[PDB]
Amino acid sequence: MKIKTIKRSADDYVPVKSTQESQMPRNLNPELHPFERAREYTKALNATKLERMFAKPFVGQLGYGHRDGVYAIAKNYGSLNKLATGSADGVIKYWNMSTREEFVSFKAHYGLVTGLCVTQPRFHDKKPDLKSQNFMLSCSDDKTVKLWSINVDDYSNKNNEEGLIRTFDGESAFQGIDSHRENSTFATGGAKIHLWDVNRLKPVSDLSWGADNITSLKFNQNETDILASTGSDNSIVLYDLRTNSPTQKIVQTMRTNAICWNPMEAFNFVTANEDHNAYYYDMRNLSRSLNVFKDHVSAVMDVDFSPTGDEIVTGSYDKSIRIYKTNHGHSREIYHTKRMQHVFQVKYSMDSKYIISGSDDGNVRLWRSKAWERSNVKTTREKNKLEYDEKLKERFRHMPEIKRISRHRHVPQVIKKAQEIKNIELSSIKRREANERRTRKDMPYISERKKQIVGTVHKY
Amino acid sequence: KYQSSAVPFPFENREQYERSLRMPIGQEWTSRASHQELIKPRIMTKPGQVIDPLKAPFK
Amino acid sequence: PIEYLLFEEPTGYAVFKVKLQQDDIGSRLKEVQEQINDFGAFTKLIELVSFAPFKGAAEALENANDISEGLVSESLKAILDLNLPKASSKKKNITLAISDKNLGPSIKEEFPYVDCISNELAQDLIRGVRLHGEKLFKGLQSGDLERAQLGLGHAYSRAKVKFSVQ
Amino acid sequence: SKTRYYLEQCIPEMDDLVEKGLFTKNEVSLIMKKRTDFEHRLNSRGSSINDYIKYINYESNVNKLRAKRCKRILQVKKTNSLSDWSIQQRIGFIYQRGTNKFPQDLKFW
Amino acid sequence: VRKLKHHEQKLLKKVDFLEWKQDQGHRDTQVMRTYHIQNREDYHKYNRICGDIRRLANKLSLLPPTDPFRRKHEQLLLDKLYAMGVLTTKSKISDLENKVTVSAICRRRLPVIMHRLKMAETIQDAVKFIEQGHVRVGPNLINDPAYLVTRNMEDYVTWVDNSKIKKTLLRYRNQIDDFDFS
Amino acid sequence: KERENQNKFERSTYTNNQTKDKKLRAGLKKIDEQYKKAVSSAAATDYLLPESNGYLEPENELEKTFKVQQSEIKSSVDVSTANKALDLSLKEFGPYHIKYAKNGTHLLITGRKGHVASMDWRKGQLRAELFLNETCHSATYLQNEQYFAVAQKKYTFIYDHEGTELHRLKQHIEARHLDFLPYHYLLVTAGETGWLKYHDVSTGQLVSELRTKAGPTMAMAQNPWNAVMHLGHSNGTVSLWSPSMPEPLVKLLSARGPVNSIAIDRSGYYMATTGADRSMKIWDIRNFKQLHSVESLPTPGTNVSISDTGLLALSRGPHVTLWKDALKLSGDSKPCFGSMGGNPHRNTPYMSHLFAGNKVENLGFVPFEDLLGVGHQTGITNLIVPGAGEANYDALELNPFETKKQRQEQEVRTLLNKLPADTITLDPNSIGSVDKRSSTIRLNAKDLDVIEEALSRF
RNA sequence: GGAAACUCAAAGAGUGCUAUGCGGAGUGCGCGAGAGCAUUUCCGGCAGCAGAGAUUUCAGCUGU
Incomplete structure (x- = not known):
């Protein structure tokens, strides 16, 4: 008869010396670990509660702010911690965002500044040193475009030519700027859209359809020869610079404030227009705006993508910005503060982590995108835990109290009143439409994405 | 208030939803390697560098 | 984009590779400026990859003189061209993080394939590695830093002031 | 605890090495026992190069016993399984860990 | 139990292992430390009596102000609680809700009146003495500390004779007479 | 990829007995592909668990497993376990109810x-030793060694680690059987009054004042897998209960007369019950089907306890009789007392031990050792039962080598991850489901007499 | 009633501590290469030869 029991042996389980770590011997038996679903459900509850108590998104403003109100903002697309910022008294600055103050500032134009971007120019008489100094440019109300240097201090290859290396002059006013990110050719929206490079002081091309001004425009991030614009005909016009021609136009109901292309998809853009929703359009099939991000209460002033290409940010004329996922169509998150007002230009920093919001009261602010995460390097147990319960919140997203916690924000009560009365009048329009649909023979269903389009040149 | 109301958007009925939720993902009920490969986000960025718009193919 | 940094010590030069980049926009935040005070989370940023000590104390005084006048000395030239990878034409210029804009152009002239960064981020992780110090090397040196800079300090002071011997 | 990650990194080679008939589970659990103790002593706190050395010595000896029972039982030089490269590649992995953790001693280098 | 961190303290506020809600601030524990009550449940066998007399005073106030059953039984209960010394004055029937306390019905116990008339010097020492069997009220000795006294018997609380504490205090004053055997 | 314990590691689903959306199709194929990968790589851990369970066997045809003396196995087993088989002798106080901790660490x-x-x-190690003068029926630990609740003469008290009292429960107006639902942090009490009542012991709240409507509660037992409490009343009714709904969830009728004891297998799948009709029943629980019914054991079974390896323990007054392989579904696995003429299709019991003259008031196994603590009149005895324990405990939840710092951290971790008192369900996998109403397939707002024929028209 | 410890129990703070992620090739591309692509292309077989190396290891051929 053979008898053996457990041999616990007290050496493999408690260490022999007082520094080395003991085993955690471990049996992955469902018999051992009793409640799977309730336990990880409660871990999802704790994770949603923890992000609702860690959602501290405001980083800080930068500098003492502008004078009159930020109306133009342009990140530079090849460096992380600097962006240019122009306010409509005339004053444009080049902010360094690490230390949060400007490199330099200037009184640029007499009237408003209406557009500014950044450039890596190429002159045919110079190696353009794009590492010891850094160039922006700006078009404005006083019929002038100015290509501007900045003595930046990030490298130390050297040891002087501070401002206004050259001026362009136009016969009408100007409204928008962006630059073809190769071959130093940039494009302006004014009373008519002009294409010019930095080597000659005349418009190399007219580009407009007809007599209507161009309220904004934006180049592409890839297929850089193509660009889009928005005119006060409530119209989107795409241009291709290879054929040097406009190429299609759609007219919508209300005026499109600002375009921004996709960095990843490269033929999808987002229009922000004055009806209170942004429109993720395709390019190749411009008859169905393939997403509509809806949850605003006033005109949506600008928008840009995250550089990761799947999360966009709209800033609107109500005193609140909000950040959308691409494939939902409703607000992922709302940022607002009492001191920001009429937020006009919101852009996304080039590492998809920060949201720069330039308001109308002058200040330009930093925000985090993921409002609960933090920006330090994490030990891999913290990384595994935060990523773990991120995935866990994602799969238990539809439980009806995890959803109410992860959906609860605190909006200002102006936006609350406007959103709920928008809800009751939308329900009223839906009910009266249901009555007409009950009686009338053919009131055909139009999609929500196809609703706002009022026309399109080149039907196929 | 624990079982959800309807079937959520990407799925279509409750066998889809429960076949999604059938496997717990914690390190208790699953191994460490299957844990750390089951959980990682769809995007994953490196923390301090500019993200370029992709230009592929034929560099 | 900060790939390497060069730290100049009393015993000799050290060159560190940078594994993870520090965050650039939130660099004035509490939770980022505390990770350069935590050692176990500062070593997630910076790996030691080379350390050439000064051969003699006379060469230690000579290198201290050459750094104080911002010049490049030959041991520094040796450790830089050992550690820094040669780049292609202009794509991917390699990057040091040094501590002064006067040492900048001199090693730029000695190495036209190398770019020098001395901004707030560079001085930030420089003072991180100065704070932690000899714990980075895990004993890979022949010298104690406080007594070494004692001797180097009296030497450098004496040679600067021309203190007489008789 | 990343020791669990290493310890269940090493499972598939012993899985195939058991399902082909050269060890049995009643002794691969013994080598798994000693491997567990070695990994804990290795990536614990206050560890040492002698712990790395004894881990290298034990893994080389179980590699030699693997080749011995391979040519004895199966009468072949190798069984083209996953194990035959795996055991020396994790010896090299131990060496890499020891050089990264302790770049001081030229003996281990 | 661990002096929880800030996020843990926020995630669970209502935990308290020591003091729950239904402890009522641990007043039974606090007053039995105050009056050195030996056994458990003595507080609640007092509190049952306190709730009983406020229930009966409630029902007597409910009964109408003219009938002799109500007026006789309320003056009877008031005189009975004076004769047990739970009160101090023959006060109003409002003091049958402001003034009856489990602390008062404890305050008529034997060791606390013993400390009150300075027989011992602390109530723990009084329970020591009357558990060693030194005191008596009138003729009969008292062994248990749960014997509370009446208004009548706060005068014949004296030790027994041959109690050697009585002998030591009499020999302290050197009035130690020894013909009376103590 | 074989992984023979896949049948142990699978997780079944609410099924029907193929789509059209391509994105949904690829999502589902990725989901069940990673399900199969996670099941295989989870069952690839039995190479990594340290030591096997103990056992014994006759390895002859003459001797049997049950007529093996504790002296003999205490001679043939190692010194540590032979030293752990303690036999306390305490005479002056009464019969000694026995409660180990959830690990094997205390008593x-x-x-x-x-x-x-x-x-x-x-x-x-003396932690807390107190003689309180009134009678104590039963007692248990709460979550650690740090707190233990004693069911005194009427009022239930709970106590600190060193013996101080912390709460005299004003409710639980008497008590006879306590238990602790450990993941829910619920101290549950039942007794002579027909009141099963639950107490959230973390925040100090009551949870449920459930009226039993069945007289006193003769024996209660926790199901360790879905956390329902199985009360067994005087009717023979073993009714099993949850704090969320007042009506008893499921009323089994196991025995006749009063039910003397109930014991649930740790997999939640079998329930062993003894009545005062001299009867023992084995129950399926997940299908509610009486498995097999040992009738007329020769004396009333006082207590049953099932180990962590499916090992039946029956206390027949002065006897302790242990059956192995008694919790299968066959007809072989009915536990009997004799192999009639040497019949190889019976469960002659795995071990047996007759005590001297003392009634054993409760069995209870030790969690992670191969020994059971039986409590009788004159004290406590551990019995070496070699197949009565999980050798491979999981150190992420409960640890028999746990120190002070990890004790504090493990209890505060369970205190954050305490399940709420509502999700006590008859099956634990009904939280991520959908409602039984609000039908399965979702709809996306698109589909929500000739003379009489002559005298028609009027 | 005051005081010894390796008497234990329970909390707290500080100092530390790293806390710490198919293969040789060969074959054409990727601006002297590997940071990817792709494999029957020989091999990771058998004995011997003879050049070596501390019995067991490598270097080039016969058949295989």
Whole structure:
């Protein structure tokens, strides 16, 4: 008869010396670990509660702010911690965002500044040193475009030519700027859209359809020869610079404030227009705006993508910005503060982590995108835990109290009143439409994405 | 208030939803390697560098 | 984009590779400026990859003189061209993080394939590695830093002031 | 605890090495026992190069016993399984860990 | 139990292992430390009596102000609680809700009146003495500390004779007479 | 990729007995592909668990497994376990109810006269030893060794680690059987009054004042897998209960007369019950089907306890009889007392031990050792039962080598991850489901007499 | 009633501590290469030869 029991042996389980770590011997038996679903459900509850108590998104403003109100903002697309910022008294600055103050500032134009971007120019008489100094440019109300240097201090290859290396002059006013990110050719929206490079002081091309001004425009991030614009005909016009021609136009109901292309998809853009929703359009099939991000209460002033290409940010004329996922169509998150007002230009920093919001009261602010995460390097147990319960919140997203916690924000009560009365009048329009649909023979269903389009040149 | 109301958007009925939720993902009920490969986000960025718009193919 | 940094010590030069980049926009935040005070989370940023000590104390005084006048000395030239990878034409210029804009152009002239960064981020992780110090090397040196800079300090002071011997 | 990650990194080679008939589970659990103790002593706190050395010595000896029972039982030089490269590649992995953790001693280098 | 961190303290506020809600601030524990009550449940066998007399005073106030059953039984209960010394004055029937306390019905116990008339010097020492069997009220000795006294018997609380504490205090004053055997 | 314990590691689903959306199709194929990968790589851990369970066997045809003396196995087993088989002899106070902790680390003994001692038993360590004068029926630990609740003469008290009292429960107006639902942090009490009542012991709240409507509660037992409490009343009814709904969830009718004891297998799948009709029943639980019914054991079974490896323990007054392989579904696995003429299709019991003259009031196994603590009149005895324990405990939840710092951290981790008192369900996998109403397939707002024929038209 | 410890129990703070992620090739591309692509292209077989190396290891051929 053979008898053996457990041999616990007290050496493999408690260490022999007082520094080395003991085993955690471990049996992955469902018999051992009793409640799977309730336990990880409660871990999802704790994770949603923890992000609702860690959602501290405001980083800080930068500098003492502008004078009159930020109306133009342009990140530079090849460096992380600097962006240019122009306010409509005339004053444009080049902010360094690490230390949060400007490199330099200037009184640029007499009237408003209406557009500014950044450039890596190429002159045919110079190696353009794009590492010891850094160039922006700006078009404005006083019929002038100015290509501007900045003595930046990030490298130390050297040891002087501070401002206004050259001026362009136009016969009408100007409204928008962006630059073809190769071959130093940039494009302006004014009373008519002009294409010019930095080597000659005349418009190399007219580009407009007809007599209507161009309220904004934006180049592409890839297929850089193509660009889009928005005119006060409530119209989107795409241009291709290879054929040097406009190429299609759609007219919508209300005026499109600002375009921004996709960095990843490269033929999808987002229009922000004055009806209170942004429109993720395709390019190749411009008859169905393939997403509509809806949850605003006033005109949506600008928008840009995250550089990761799947999360966009709209800033609107109500005193609140909000950040959308691409494939939902409703607000992922709302940022607002009492001191920001009429937020006009919101852009996304080039590492998809920060949201720069330039308001109308002058200040330009930093925000985090993921409002609960933090920006330090994490030990891999913290990384595994935060990523773990991120995935866990994602799969238990539809439980009806995890959803109410992860959906609860605190909006200002102006936006609350406007959103709920928008809800009751939308329900009223839906009910009266249901009555007409009950009686009338053919009131055909139009999609929500196809609703706002009022026309399109080149039907196929 | 624990079982959800309807079937959520990407799925279509409750066998889809429960076949999604059938496997717990914690390190208790699953191994460490299957844990750390089951959980990682769809995007994953490196923390301090500019993200370029992709230009592929034929560099 | 900060790939390497060069730290100049009393015993000799050290060159560190940078594994993870520090965050650039939130660099004035509490939770980022505390990770350069935590050692176990500062070593997630910076790996030691080379350390050439000064051969003699006379060469230690000579290198201290050459750094104080911002010049490049030959041991520094040796450790830089050992550690820094040669780049292609202009794509991917390699990057040091040094501590002064006067040492900048001199090693730029000695190495036209190398770019020098001395901004707030560079001085930030420089003072991180100065704070932690000899714990980075895990004993890979022949010298104690406080007594070494004692001797180097009296030497450098004496040679600067021309203190007489008789 | 990343020791669990290493310890269940090493499972598939012993899985195939058991399902082909050269060890049995009643002794691969013994080598798994000693491997567990070695990994804990290795990536614990206050560890040492002698712990790395004894881990290298034990893994080389179980590699030699693997080749011995391979040519004895199966009468072949190798069984083209996953194990035959795996055991020396994790010896090299131990060496890499020891050089990264302790770049001081030229003996281990 | 661990002096929880800030996020843990926020995630669970209502935990308290020591003091729950239904402890009522641990007043039974606090007053039995105050009056050195030996056994458990003595507080609640007092509190049952306190709730009983406020229930009966409630029902007597409910009964109408003219009938002799109500007026006789309320003056009877008031005189009975004076004769047990739970009160101090023959006060109003409002003091049958402001003034009856489990602390008062404890305050008529034997060791606390013993400390009150300075027989011992602390109530723990009084329970020591009357558990060693030194005191008596009138003729009969008292062994248990749960014997509370009446208004009548706060005068014949004296030790027994041959109690050697009585002998030591009499020999302290050197009035130690020894013909009376103590 | 074979992984023979896949049948142990699978997780079944609410099924029907193929789509059109391509994105949904690829999502589902990725989901069940990673399900199969996670099941295989989870069952690839049995190479990594340290040591196997113990056992014995006759390895002859003459001797049997049950007629093996504790002296013989205490001689043939190692010195550590032979030293761990303690036999306390305490005479002056009453019969001693026995409650180990959830691990094997401590031990709580209660004499019916007055005597409760919480002690480490592996090392001899007095933690709290108190004689409180009134009678104590039963007692248990709460979450650690740090707190233990004693069911005194009427009022239930809970106590600190060193013997101080912390709460005299104004409710639980008497008590006879306590238990602790450990993941829910719920101290559950039942007794002579027909009141099963639950107490959230973390925040100090009551949870449920459930009226039993069945007289006193003769024996209660926790299901360790869905956390329902199985009460067994005087009717023979074993009714099983949840704090969320007042009506008893499921009313089994197991025995006749009163039910003397209930014991649930740790997999939640079998329930062993003894009545005062001299009957023992084995129950399926997940299908509610009476498995097999040992009728007319020769004396009333006082207590049953099932180990962590499916090992039946029956206390026949002065006897302790242990059956192995008694929790299968066959007809072989009915536990009997004799192999009639040497019949190889019976469960002659795995071990047996007759005590001297003392009634054993409760069995209870030790969690992670191969020994059971039986409590009788004159004290406590550990019995070496070689197949009665999970050798491979999981150190992420409960650890028999747990120190002070990890004790504090493990209890505060369970205190954050306490399941709420509502999700006590008859099956634990009904939280991520959908409602039984609000039908399965979702709809996306698109589909929500000739003379009489002559005298028509009027 | 005051005081010894390796008497134990329970909390707290500080100092530390790293806390710490198919293969040789060969074959054409990727601006002297590997940071990817792709494999029957020989091999990771058998004995011997003879050049070596501390019995067991490598270097080039016969058949295989």
